[PDB]
Amino acid sequence: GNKNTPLNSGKHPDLKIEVAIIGAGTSGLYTAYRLVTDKKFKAHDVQIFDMNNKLGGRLESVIMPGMNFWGELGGMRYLTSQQIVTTLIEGYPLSEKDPNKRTPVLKDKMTPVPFPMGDPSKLLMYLRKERFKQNAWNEAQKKGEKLPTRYYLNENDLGFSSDQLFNKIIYDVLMADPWVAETYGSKIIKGSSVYDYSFKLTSRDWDDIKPKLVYNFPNSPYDQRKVNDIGFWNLIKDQVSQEGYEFLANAGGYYSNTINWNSAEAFPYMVGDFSAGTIYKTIEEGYDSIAYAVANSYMEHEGACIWSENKLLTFTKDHPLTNTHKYELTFLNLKTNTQWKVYANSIVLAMPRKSLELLDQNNFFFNINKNSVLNNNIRSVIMEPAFKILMGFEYPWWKELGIDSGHSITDLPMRQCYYFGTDPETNNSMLLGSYGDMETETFWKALSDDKVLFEVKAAKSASLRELHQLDDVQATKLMVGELMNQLRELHGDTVTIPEPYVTYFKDWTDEPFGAGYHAWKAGFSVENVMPYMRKPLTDEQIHICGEAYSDQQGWVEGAFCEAEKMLQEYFGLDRPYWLSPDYYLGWE
Amino acid sequence: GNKNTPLNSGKHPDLKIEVAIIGAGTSGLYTAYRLVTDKKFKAHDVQIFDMNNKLGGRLESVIMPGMNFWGELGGMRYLTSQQIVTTLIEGYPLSEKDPNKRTPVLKDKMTPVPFPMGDPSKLLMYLRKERFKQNAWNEAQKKGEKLPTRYYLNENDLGFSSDQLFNKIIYDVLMADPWVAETYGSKIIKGSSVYDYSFKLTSRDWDDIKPKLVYNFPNSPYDQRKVNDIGFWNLIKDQVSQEGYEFLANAGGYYSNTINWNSAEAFPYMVGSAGTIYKTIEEGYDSIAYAVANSYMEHEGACIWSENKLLTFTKDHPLTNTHKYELTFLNLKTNTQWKVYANSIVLAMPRKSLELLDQNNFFFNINKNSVLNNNIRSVIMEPAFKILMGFEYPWWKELGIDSGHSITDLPMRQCYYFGTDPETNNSMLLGSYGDMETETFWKALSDDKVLFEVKAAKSASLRELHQLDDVQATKLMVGELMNQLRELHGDTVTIPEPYVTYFKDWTDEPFGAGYHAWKAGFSVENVMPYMRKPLTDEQIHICGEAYSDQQGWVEGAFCEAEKMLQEYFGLDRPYWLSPDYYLGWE
Ligand SMILES: Cc1cc2nc3c(=O)[nH]c(=O)nc-3n(C[C@H](O)[C@H](O)[C@H](O)COP(=O)(O)OP(=O)(O)OC[C@H]3O[C@@H](n4cnc5c(N)ncnc54)[C@H](O)[C@@H]3O)c2cc1C
Ligand SMILES: Cc1cc2nc3c(=O)[nH]c(=O)nc-3n(C[C@H](O)[C@H](O)[C@H](O)COP(=O)(O)OP(=O)(O)OC[C@H]3O[C@@H](n4cnc5c(N)ncnc54)[C@H](O)[C@@H]3O)c2cc1C
């Protein structure tokens, strides 16, 4: 099938090429695909290297025995307003509604499906031991009530849901800047209902606002500072009190980023880049199918090669072949523990902050004594931890509360569970747990570090034969134990929860990732850092791309967009023919 | 005065000695002091090296203009049951009550004083917007009430204070182990009041219990596991619910460690006696570091090399006939490297300091010394930040607050009302945060470039105050701390702006932490003796607070150094130290 893309765990000592791409994630794969498809180099002269035994980086889809559908260890969904990932998956143009009348860009067949949001009638919000339905705030407001909670909000914020309060905070901040309220008042909209705030601000509008927006609150410790220079927890507490911050931080799930990051960058991240008709979708064959579709398109050019289980150690300008090649790269061939040299004229580091820090810091590129600016910009983002646990049950116990799909949210350390689906033949049913924020990394770490692993157990269409293949990826007994205990407290006593037969634990804080996703720090010029990272030194053909230093952090689109900007800026490529000239990219 | 201990910022290329001590913190200073006082080596053959421009490491006392008394940036107090730091400060024996009838161990004069605890009638607990007095739980229980709070406790725990609930948790866990309830039931005591739990477990009893204690709770995810293998947040939630954990985590400040660290190690850390009190040193707590440094330095040839940073060390060098090890130092004043030759290396330095050394040498090499690397990572680096703030008057006295500290779930977490100059009335507050993600709340503010501007006050000229320009907190941090201090105390007291601040971030290199905490699942009884000499064929030792069993204390640093000294440097117990003070296995 399409996910058997060949991977070379071998080596070719003294390989000579033009472009070394390090990282077979979304950005690396897309760089390789674009360079060869546009004939900028022959396939043999553009090679990808990865230390992993798979392509896709933070996309990793899995089929667990007994359950014939894809679980997601990493990314799961896209937005149709994200035009690179959307066009590459669905084909062009995006104006055609008939998928049959669309021209595919990539050969691999990918079945787009809507991403289940579920029923807010049946999905749980479990905060300070109070079990609400997610529609509790809506239901209350229809009866003209202000829903009481065990958070002590400011009086003027009482009855607001988390969504409504964020919308209010962002409205209040934008409209206190005279220049913003005047220049964009049209697209910053107070409705008639006290809880009704909407935004029509485009990605390009946000690019105008973010660097200029001033925090205009006369008694605030943060008065007259760029909102850029204010952490998001700082700003949310200043606006709705620390009890307000506890409500918003605890009542948001994976998508909702309430760490103390760049408030200016946080605003668009929370209200969107305007919308109508855009929905969340995934790929029936698993979301990592998009990585395999780009890899396979690159690999259909003979000479193309993904080197797997090959780890970049270091690179230097001081080597025997400076007549043909500016750079010598050293790789560790993990299978053999043998080092080998590669010669290249361009290096693309398609890899996140932690991956950059794990490279030899003593070389000409990273040297702190020389490149203090590089090192400051590498540290311009927060490494956010993310963990995923997939759990297979003999039946979907959640259906007893009328839950089909979607996710429950709680201030318990588990934070979130997605009811991910039921094999209609075996009835075997998948849950995924997603935690990491509000110190929950430290709650779970002790349990995930324990040595005694969960034992697989036979179930419908899942033999011990098949399940012992996943022995080494099982969650720990203590983690499964405590997650079962928290799932019982979350759902309540009315529903029996059986033990799972199979688990799959993934820790994205593991090297070389060191993070699920990244978040701009307060006080950095993001408009200046991004173009800098795409080529840090004026006299070196070394580029950084991927999600970490994108302005769409937490998304494949971020990784594709930084690669695309890098390609137009330094590799002489035009916008792809399949990409609308009106999709907004950046300054260039 | 006693704090002008000479420091050599220079270098001596190819210096040849026996024992290189890296770190002029409490453990390094005490190693040097013990080796020369017991004449194990001549003072020229035992040298201390530090990258800082002062000795004392995580002890740093300061006098700020306008206020004639010592502020503490780092450690502030000791317990009289901590027998090394207590004897070194006060002299021997510890049974004598008259300080005049005591024999000093060190020449420097140090004035012991009680550490002000304050009045729980007047000190604040501000949790989820409810302002209690710290005695609210006691007062309620006297009127036979169960004090209500905005934490939703299990019903069987309602009305308990944070102290009472911890005591209950620890009682319940110990008594569920048949072997413990039977072997130590005598010293694990339920009173008649529902809230009354006390302990008489000694350090030696805890060393017996910690490695064996089993968690006996049949429906628990953690049932039949060593308590050693359970994180403390894990254990507290299993015992009093996640809302119970929120209560205990938020209502502790004062040396209350509720991170997800080793539960077995956490138990003694929480219940601790009688007659033992908290004390400080009137001349500032770093005086104990200066007293040990000065005692070492009164031996001819003794030297603290300051602003000299260890980079690396190797067995592959030109002088292996006289010296097993060549050390390379960065002379920070010149940015030049120089070699030192030695037969023993003592790394008197915490986890982050070890990690900042050249990891590629024979010692740290991960490909060979995987157990060293695992054990270096056996402890959590707990962040700590301190902000001293000088006010023209003690605004806190208006609420009848003399002294002690208020606690809150606001990000500021804790303020100590540290004292008032009786002549100028200038009054010092210290803010202490870092836990419960408060590191990330404050970091954005502390990293901002625009610094708080000093302002003249009684007996504090701009002349004197501009000397501290570069250590002022940021305007944003002072701004937000003032905002949180007003919400903490309430509207009944006006709080003026400070005239001076002093910001200290202990997460800065090379410290990387205020203090350390054993992780769950490590054999601490086996890691400690390992860290004091990791490789059987190398004379390289680690000592200090980080891998002690009294983390967060000078006593931990002294005790690991003392064990290291008796184990590998052929020293006897000091004559001034009681043979009955329990040290470890050896
Ligand atoms: C839990 C989770 C949920 C997510 N949800 C979504 C979502 O719903 N939708 C979405 O669009 N995005 C989502 N994302 C992001 C998505 O996973 C993207 O792939 C991600 O944004 C990163 O792609 P990238 O090119 O930056 O590289 P990465 O995926 O970070 O790839 C980096 C690669 O570099 C390799 N590498 C690093 N160092 C070296 C070295 N020295 N030598 C060799 N190889 C090296 C690594 O092995 C890896 O393969 C999610 C991420 C996570 C973790
Ligand atoms: C906020 C705070 C409050 C505290 N409160 C108390 C308290 O009230 N009472 C109490 O008893 N204890 C307290 N402690 C602990 C106390 O400060 C002790 O000093 C501490 O426990 C550690 O002493 P140490 O020997 O481990 O070394 P450290 O104090 O960590 O000294 C290490 C030294 O090594 C040096 N160094 C590191 N790397 C290198 C290198 N490569 N080359 C050269 N030099 C290097 C550093 O410059 C430093 O001087 C507190 C700690 C903090 C942070």
- Would B129 be classed as within a structural domain? no
Do B186 and B217 have their domain in common?
yes
**3-state class of B389 per DSSP?**
strand
Q: Taking a C-beta distance cutoff of 8 angstroms, is the pair A425, A463 a contact?
A: no
Please state, in angstroms and as integers, the Cα–Cα distance from residue B199 to each residue in A140, A261, B159, B216, B283, following that order: 51, 45, 21, 20, 34
Contacts for B230 with CB less than 8 Å, ≥ 6 apart: A446, B215, B222, B238, B263, B520
Contacts for B480 with CB less than 8 Å, ≥ 6 apart: A221, A222, A234, B445
- Would B396 be classed as within a structural domain? no
Contacts for B45 with CB less than 8 Å, ≥ 6 apart: B17, B18, B19, B301
Please state, in angstroms and as integers, the Cα–Cα distance from residue B489 to each residue in B106, B122, B135, B397, B492, following that order: 43, 11, 16, 12, 8
Which ligand has the minimum distance to the alpha carbon of residue A79? 1
**3-state class of B74 per DSSP?**
coil
Tokens describing residue A23 = 């990282």
Asked whether the CA dihedral B472, B476, B479, B482 is positive or negative, the reply is negative
- Would A517 be classed as within a structural domain? no
Ligand 2 pocket, Cβ-based, cut-off 6 angstroms: B 22-28, 49-52, 57-59, 74-78, 309-310, 348-350, 353, 356-357, 384, 386, 506, 510-511, 514-515, 544-545, 552-554, 556-557
Tokens describing residue B578 = 């009681």
State the pairing for strand pair B325-331/B71-72: unpaired
Contacts for B508 with CB less than 8 Å, ≥ 6 apart: none
Q: Taking a C-beta distance cutoff of 8 angstroms, is the pair A448, A387 a contact?
A: yes
Tokens describing residue A429 = 């049913």
Range list of H helices, A210-362: 232-251, 263-271, 289-299, 353-357
Q: Which CATH number goes with the domain that contains A11? A: 3.50.50.60
Chain A residues within 8 A of B441 when measuring between CB atoms = 231, 233-234, 237, 260
Can you say how many angstroms the Cα of residue A424 is from the centroid of all Cα atoms in its chain? 30
Q: Taking a C-beta distance cutoff of 8 angstroms, is the pair A133, A120 a contact?
A: yes
**3-state class of B568 per DSSP?**
helix
Going by C-alpha positions, the residue among B212, B317, B203, B286 that lies closest to residue B548 is: B203
> In chain A, what is the straight-line distance between the N-terminal and C-terminal CA atoms, in Å?
39
Distance, in Å, from the CA atom of B168 to the CA atom of A335, rounded to the nearest integer, reads 53
Strand partners, B429: B389, B417
Q: Report whether residue A30 contacts ligand 1, using a CB cutoff of 6 Å.
A: no
- Would A569 be classed as within a structural domain? yes
Atom 44 in ligand 1: which residue has the minimum CA distance?
A50
Do A97 and A28 have their domain in common?
yes
- Which of A363, A443, A493 has the highest number of chain B CBs within 10 A, making it the mutation to test binding with B? A443
Which residue is associated with the tokens 């009335």?
B425
- Would B506 be classed as within a structural domain? no
Do B234 and B322 have their domain in common?
no
Distance, in Å, from the CA atom of A200 to the CA atom of A187, rounded to the nearest integer, reads 5
Going by C-alpha positions, the residue among B512, B511, B530 that lies closest to residue B522 is: B530
Going by C-alpha positions, the residue among B179, B498, B541 that lies closest to residue B348 is: B541
Do A256 and A286 have their domain in common?
no
Distance, in Å, from the CA atom of A342 to the CA atom of A325, rounded to the nearest integer, reads 10
Q: Residue B103: in which H helix or E strand, if any?
A: none
Of the residues B271, B296, B314, the one at which a domain ends? B271
Check CB contact under 8 Å for B521 and A449: yes
Do B257 and B285 have their domain in common?
no
| Exposure string for A452-472, b = 16+ CB within 10 A, e = fewer | ebbebeebeebeeeebeebee
- Would A453 be classed as within a structural domain? yes
**3-state class of A64 per DSSP?**
coil
Q: Report whether residue A556 contacts ligand 1, using a CB cutoff of 6 Å.
A: yes
Q: Taking a C-beta distance cutoff of 8 angstroms, is the pair A533, A570 a contact?
A: no
- Would B442 be classed as within a structural domain? no
Please state, in angstroms and as integers, the Cα–Cα distance from residue A176 to each residue in A30, A171, B319, following that order: 42, 9, 71
- Would A528 be classed as within a structural domain? yes
Which residue range is the domain that position A139 belongs to? 116-149+387-507
Domain count, chain A: 3
Please state, in angstroms and as integers, the Cα–Cα distance from residue B185 to each residue in B145, B169, B189, following that order: 30, 15, 7
Do A255 and A185 have their domain in common?
yes
Q: Taking a C-beta distance cutoff of 8 angstroms, is the pair B545, B556 a contact?
A: yes
Q: Report whether residue A388 contacts ligand 1, using a CB cutoff of 6 Å.
A: yes
Chain B residues within 8 A of A150 when measuring between CB atoms = 150, 152
Distance, in Å, from the CA atom of A8 to the CA atom of A547, rounded to the nearest integer, reads 25
Q: Report whether residue A350 contacts ligand 1, using a CB cutoff of 6 Å.
A: yes
Residue A125 main-chain phi, psi, to 5 deg: -125, 105
Residue B409 main-chain phi, psi, to 5 deg: -90, 0
State the pairing for strand pair B427-433/B540-543: unpaired
**3-state class of B344 per DSSP?**
strand
Distance, in Å, from the CA atom of A77 to the CA atom of A85, rounded to the nearest integer, reads 10
Atom 24 in ligand 2: which residue has the minimum CA distance?
B544
Technique behind the model: X-ray
Range list of H helices, B324-470: 351-355, 370-376, 438-447, 462-465
> In chain B, what is the straight-line distance between the N-terminal and C-terminal CA atoms, in Å?
39
Tokens describing residue B425 = 């009335």
Contacts for A166 with CB less than 8 Å, ≥ 6 apart: A248, A270, A271
Q: Taking a C-beta distance cutoff of 8 angstroms, is the pair A522, A231 a contact?
A: yes
Of the residues B251, B271, B291, the one at which a domain ends? B271
State the pairing for strand pair A19-22/A346-350: parallel
Strand partners, B124: B133
Contacts for A277 with CB less than 8 Å, ≥ 6 apart: A80
Residue B452 main-chain phi, psi, to 5 deg: -55, 130
Distance, in Å, from the CA atom of B472 to the CA atom of B282, rounded to the nearest integer, reads 24
Residue B329 main-chain phi, psi, to 5 deg: -110, 145
**3-state class of A398 per DSSP?**
helix
**B510 preceded by a cis bond (ω within 30 of 0):** yes
Check CB contact under 8 Å for B411 and A237: yes
Do B196 and B236 have their domain in common?
yes
Helices B232-251 and A477-491: angle between axes, nearest 10 degrees: 50
Q: Taking a C-beta distance cutoff of 8 angstroms, is the pair A2, A300 a contact?
A: no
Query: How is chain A split among helix, strand and coil, in percent rounded to 5?
Result: 30, 20, 50
Tokens describing residue A513 = 């990732």
Residue A560 main-chain phi, psi, to 5 deg: -60, -40
Encode B166-180 in three state secondary structure.
HHHHHHHHHHHCHHH
Which atom, in ligand 1's list, is nearest to the CA of A331? 42
Going by C-alpha positions, the residue among A517, A547, A529 that lies closest to residue A211 is: A529
**B104 preceded by a cis bond (ω within 30 of 0):** no
Do A401 and A334 have their domain in common?
no
Strand partners, B516: B381
Cα dihedral: B380, B485, B248, B134 (round 10): 140
Do B265 and B284 have their domain in common?
no
Q: Taking a C-beta distance cutoff of 8 angstroms, is the pair B446, B503 a contact?
A: yes
Q: Taking a C-beta distance cutoff of 8 angstroms, is the pair A581, A108 a contact?
A: no
Do B231 and B195 have their domain in common?
yes
Distance, in Å, from the CA atom of A298 to the CA atom of A303, rounded to the nearest integer, reads 10
Helices A162-176 and A263-271: angle between axes, nearest 10 degrees: 130
Going by C-alpha positions, the residue among A442, A449, A507 that lies closest to residue B521 is: A449
A182/chain B closest Cα distance in angstroms: 28
Query: How is chain B split among helix, strand and coil, in percent rounded to 5?
Result: 30, 20, 50
Going by C-alpha positions, the residue among B123, B77, B62 that lies closest to residue B390 is: B62
The secondary structure of residue A185, as a DSSP letter, is: G
B249/chain A closest Cα distance in angstroms: 12
Of the residues A507, A540, A565, the one at which a domain ends? A507
Resolution (A): 2.2
The secondary structure of residue A378, as a DSSP letter, is: H
Please state, in angstroms and as integers, the Cα–Cα distance from residue A572 to each residue in A36, A40, A569, A576, following that order: 13, 8, 7, 12
Q: Which CATH number goes with the domain that contains A500? A: 3.90.660
Distance, in Å, from the CA atom of B213 to the CA atom of A578, rounded to the nearest integer, reads 66
Going by C-alpha positions, the residue among B325, B329, B375 that lies closest to residue B345 is: B325
Which residue is associated with the tokens 């954005």?
B444
Please state, in angstroms and as integers, the Cα–Cα distance from residue B554 to each residue in A147, B79, B222, B290, B387, following that order: 51, 10, 34, 13, 21
Distance, in Å, from the CA atom of B367 to the CA atom of B390, rounded to the nearest integer, reads 52
Going by C-alpha positions, the residue among A342, A357, A345, A354 that lies closest to residue A49 is: A342
Contacts for A541 with CB less than 8 Å, ≥ 6 apart: A326, A327, A345, A346, A347, A535, A570
Length of chain B: 586
Going by C-alpha positions, the residue among B518, B527, B531 that lies closest to residue B349 is: B531
Q: Residue A373: in which H helix or E strand, if any?
A: helix A372-378
The secondary structure of residue A98, as a DSSP letter, is: -
Q: Taking a C-beta distance cutoff of 8 angstroms, is the pair A396, A422 a contact?
A: yes
Distance, in Å, from the CA atom of A128 to the CA atom of A105, rounded to the nearest integer, reads 49
Burial-class residue B185 by CB neighbours within 10 Å (0-12, 13-18, 19+): exposed
Going by C-alpha positions, the residue among B579, B555, B553, B554 that lies closest to residue B566 is: B579
Do A22 and A124 have their domain in common?
no
Going by C-alpha positions, the residue among B463, B477, B467, B449 that lies closest to residue B389 is: B477
Do B11 and B107 have their domain in common?
yes
B360/chain A closest Cα distance in angstroms: 12
